[model samples]
Target: KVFERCELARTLKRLGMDGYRGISLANWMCLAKWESGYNTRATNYNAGDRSTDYGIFQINSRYWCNDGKTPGAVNAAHLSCSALLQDNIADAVAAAKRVVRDPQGIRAWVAWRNRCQNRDARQYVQGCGV
Candidate 1:
């Protein structure tokens, strides 16, 4: 499902991600905008490898979700990547929080590292008032 930016912010806020654990809603907005264009079904098959990143957060199947290829993938989210492709983003948000809690924090998002990190990201939120 395709989601609008403001609606995505509202939904994330409803899930208590509005400034949760020092990760601001604006940051989430930026991440989603770059990662998936707020589309729930977005998937990126980076490189020629079968490993794919899924959904709005672009959670990587190699590390965060099971692709059923590795004998025993670490499965950080302990869920399948297919599950991350759903229209409902509750699971994606939960898993994304775990990624944020990792040592890299929001840097788990390559888009964040290149675009949002070490810069003024407040413009991403503007009038959303998230």
Candidate 2:
């Protein structure tokens, strides 16, 4: 599902992701924009790596999600990659929170580092009265 930016912010806030779940909502907004453009079913294939990133947050197949064929897949989320593609994002949010808690912190997402870090992002949630 492609959510308008305002709607996405509101939804994330309602889910308690408004900079309190160890990652700022603005960072997530930037990450989702760069990773999947807010499409629920988005999938990105890394041809060189022969790996895939799935769903809105683009969780990777190598370590976070099982590809169903890779032996000894880590699967940190402990859920199927397909599950993240659902229009309802509760599962995706849960998995993403775990990712944020990893050793890399929210820096696990390069998008957040490049776009959302060290910036004033009040505008990301300025509208929708959120």
Candidate 3:
């Protein structure tokens, strides 16, 4: 499922991502935009760590979800990495929430830092009713 911009904003709002852990919906939007371009089935493999990032938020297999191949990986989300690729984003959203609970907060995603950290992330939700 490749979501339209406003469509994804509305969905994330309904999922309680608007203000989860001080991260605004726009920031979440910014993260998703750069991470996977709002595609539900997006995946990226890390050759160095032999781990994979799955789904819209690019939740990684190395520490967040289990794929049975990432060395020393932990299933912190307690689910298969395949679950994150589902068109239904509920599990992926939950996993994203769990990730920000760490000490680094939203900084956990380097993409967020590189692209959205101090940028105009509000643009992501600008025209969305969210």
Candidate closest to the true structure, highest lDDT: 3
> Global CA lDDT of candidate 2, please?
0.82
Q: Is candidate 1 or candidate 3 better by TM-score?
A: 3
Candidate 3, superposed: residue stretches over 4 Å from native: none
Q: What TM-score, to 2 decimals, does candidate 3 have? A: 0.98
Model 1 residue runs over 4 Å out of place are: 70-72
**Candidate 2 local lDDT, 35-80, one digit each (tens):** 8888889998877767788899998887787778645467888888
- Pitting candidate 2 against candidate 3, the one with the higher TM-score is 3
| Error at 129, model 3, angstroms | 0.6
- Per-candidate TM-scores read 0.89, 0.89, 0.98
Determine which window of 10 residues in candidate 1 has minimal summed lDDT: 67-76
In candidate 2, how many Å is residue 99 off? 0.6
Q: Give the alpha carbon lDDT tens digit for every residue of 42-113 in model 3.
A: 999999889999999999998899999899899887889999999999999999999999999999999999
Off by over 4 Å in 2: 70-72
lDDT on C-alpha atoms for all candidate structures: 0.84, 0.82, 0.94
